[PDB]
Amino acid sequence: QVTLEQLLARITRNAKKQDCLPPPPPRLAQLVMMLNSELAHMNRHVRATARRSIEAIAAAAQAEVWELLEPHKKHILGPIYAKPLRALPFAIQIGYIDAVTYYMSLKRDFVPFDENLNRLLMESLALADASDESLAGKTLEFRTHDFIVNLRVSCIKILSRAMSFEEFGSGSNNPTRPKVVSVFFKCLYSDSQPTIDAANDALKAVLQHTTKLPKDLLQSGLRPVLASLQDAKRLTVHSLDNLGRLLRLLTTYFKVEIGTRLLEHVKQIADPNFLQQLSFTFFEQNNAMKVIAAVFNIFHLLPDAARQFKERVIDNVLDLEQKLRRTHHSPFRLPLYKYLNKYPSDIWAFTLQKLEDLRYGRFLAQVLRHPDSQVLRDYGAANVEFIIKTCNTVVVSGKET
Amino acid sequence: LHIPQFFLASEATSPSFCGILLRFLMERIEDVGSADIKKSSILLRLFKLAFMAVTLFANQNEQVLLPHVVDIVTKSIELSTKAEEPMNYFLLLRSLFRSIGGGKFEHLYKQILPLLEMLLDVLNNLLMAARKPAERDLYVELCLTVPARLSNLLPHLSFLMRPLVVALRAGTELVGQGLRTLELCVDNLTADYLDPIMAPVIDELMTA
């Protein structure tokens, strides 16, 4: 790759737009054709190298990539439209979808919305909507799983790019866009990180672009997550992760009392005998503790109305630590710090309101010493005067504490 | 280094310290192939101590190691392609494999046998002897001591043919291991099933 970069840099020293295009001979026309021929390869490094080289050639000649690639678009588009996408092996499908996605990004009208493109997009939607067992069967094998994940990511990316075009699905009025959004939501709740990230990016982009959401579609999207949050025994880390993702996506949509229900679940799970037995061992790898930590992790994502649960959460964490005989360290400290770092004024006021007690100043001092508690330190630096004033009032009040 | 070793050898404290050490080590796993001898030797020794601790108390420490085994194998294989010294990630795998031979639970979690065996075969195929044909010995030993049950290894048995022939013409240890494996295969199979598997390498096998 480095040798190719050096050669390309050397041979385009005095390039001009005329030399990089076919005559109405040109030096770089054959080179550009050859590089463009490699954009649909089955190897991702080859595709990346080809597109890097094409961009480098275009920049030197002071031209646009679409200008250079317009004459040769057929050489890539014809073969892709000539076969049914559902019969090819995984790698060929991935390469074809990536090539089409890149081609339809150079300019708005580069790839017309003819019958072939619509058929390809419907095939991509069907593929993304399929199941692991359906796609040749998931034997738990590493390579088949990786191929399936990559194919799903490519399908999601192409559908997300098609969403940006106001032509796609507008002239049909059939459930195409709703189906795309439903597929995005279904992918957002998968067990694979790459597909999760792709779906999250696509969903946030579409939410920003639309600026509004039909009530029925969002109700359908949000039903599955709230379905599983109605039983303490059935609570799992994956459901809480999905809830956190949705809270991060749709900020001003959710409602209060979900935190109270979660706290009720936490109280139910924390059995006294269970905790007494869980002591005497390294309980950081237990499932119940992980579920409790996941529940506590959500409170820093809820809207501003969650500010009223600070005392409840602090008391819960302190009581849990007391039951387990731990200090300075427990699985619940990190999410609690994340939550407390969002309301410095409130936490400082609450702490200073209870200066006489030794159980709260110690906790706040422990919180401040963590590397990530910077906003709290800034607020304390600002209001050191208030802190000293209240301490002086307490000391002058004339008590034994 | 004796303090971790003393803690890991004691029955009372071995599980908790093993868990803490493994949690710490899985965050530095990326420094194994750092090409700085002082940085990698200590990490490799710590991994060895943890695995030996797992071996000492099988019924207590196996559940400590269970969560991390798939991560260790996959991350080693994935990171070895971009490291400055990629052989450290296979020295680590040799240390791991030498400790869980016998009867354990993680054999069930190991369902990535074809990928690991194909990768080991490819690495064995394309490698200059190097610092003496020692990389070949490392890859052959990794091939011939993969942690699995013979029933699950009955398929993928064609992945052991070339390393077996390579082992039958090497030092005493590899020769003994190859003889052991070949005797096991001959004793636990029928001719009509085994002969087609051995056909591609049978001449070299008998000559060796």
Secondary structure (DSSP) of chain B: -HHHHHHHHSTTTHHHHHHHHHHHHHHHGGGTT-S-HHHHHHHHHHHHHHHHHHHHSHHHHHHHHGGGHHHHHHHHHHHTTT-SSTTHHHHHHHHHHTTS-SS-SHHHH---HHHHHHHHHHHHHS---TTTTHHHHHHHHHHHT-S--HHHHSTTGGGGHHHHHHHTTS-HHHHHHHHHHHHHHHHTS-HHHHHHHHGGGHHHHHH-
How far is C-alpha A245 from the geometric centre of its chain's CA atoms? 8
> How far apart are the CA of A393 and the nearest CA of chain B, in angstroms?
46
- The angstrom resolution of this structure is 3.5
Report CB contact under 8 Å: A285, B15.
no
Burial of B166 (0-12, 13-18, 19+ CB in 10 A): buried
Residue keyed to tokens 């420094």: B31
Name the nearest CA neighbour of B43 among B52, B56, B30: B30
Q: How far apart are the first and last CA of chain B?
A: 44
Whole-number Å distance between alpha carbons of A263 and A295: 8
Report CB contact under 8 Å: B115, A142.
yes
String of b and e for A278-311 (b: at least 16 CB within 10 Å)? beeeebeeeeebbbbbbbbbbbbbbeeebeebbe
Residue B113 carries which side chain, given as an amino acid letter? L
B162 phi and psi angles, rounded to 5 deg: -65, -50
Q: Count of CB atoms within 10 A of residue B14's CB?
A: 19
How far is C-alpha A37 from the geometric centre of its chain's CA atoms? 34
Report CB contact under 8 Å: B19, A285.
yes
Q: Identify which of B19, B20, B115 has the shortest CB distance to residue A143.
A: B115
Is the dihedral angle over the CA atoms A312, A318, A321, A325 positive or is it negative? negative
Residue B182 tokens, joined: 């070949």
Element (H, E) at A123: helix A115-128
Q: Count of CB atoms within 10 A of residue A331's CB?
A: 18
Contact between A152 and A187 under an 8 Å Cβ cutoff? The reply is: yes
Element (H, E) at A19: none
Report CB contact under 8 Å: A141, B20.
no
Residue in chain A closest to B74 (alpha carbons) equals A142
> How far apart are the CA of B112 and the nearest CA of chain A, in angstroms?
6
Residue A346 tokens, joined: 């409130």
Integer CA distances (angstroms), A85 to A79, A121, A127, A150, A212, in order: 11, 10, 10, 15, 34
Secondary structure (DSSP) of B22-62: HHHHHHHGGGTT-S-HHHHHHHHHHHHHHHHHHHHSHHHHH
Q: What is the 3-state secondary structure (H, E, C) of A170-199?
A: CCCCCCCHHHHHHHHHHHHCCCCHHHHHHH
Name the nearest CA neighbour of A247 among A293, A301, A308, A197: A301
Name the nearest CA neighbour of B148 among B112, B191, B185: B112
Residue B31 carries which side chain, given as an amino acid letter? D
Residue A314 tokens, joined: 């602090």
All residues of chain B having their beta carbon less than 8 Å from the beta carbon of residue A141 are 111-112, 114-115
Angle between helical axes of A193-210 and A142-163 (0-180°, round to 10) = 10
Method of determination used here: cryo-EM
Residue in chain A closest to B109 (alpha carbons) equals A140
Name the nearest CA neighbour of B159 among B108, B192, B119, B129: B119
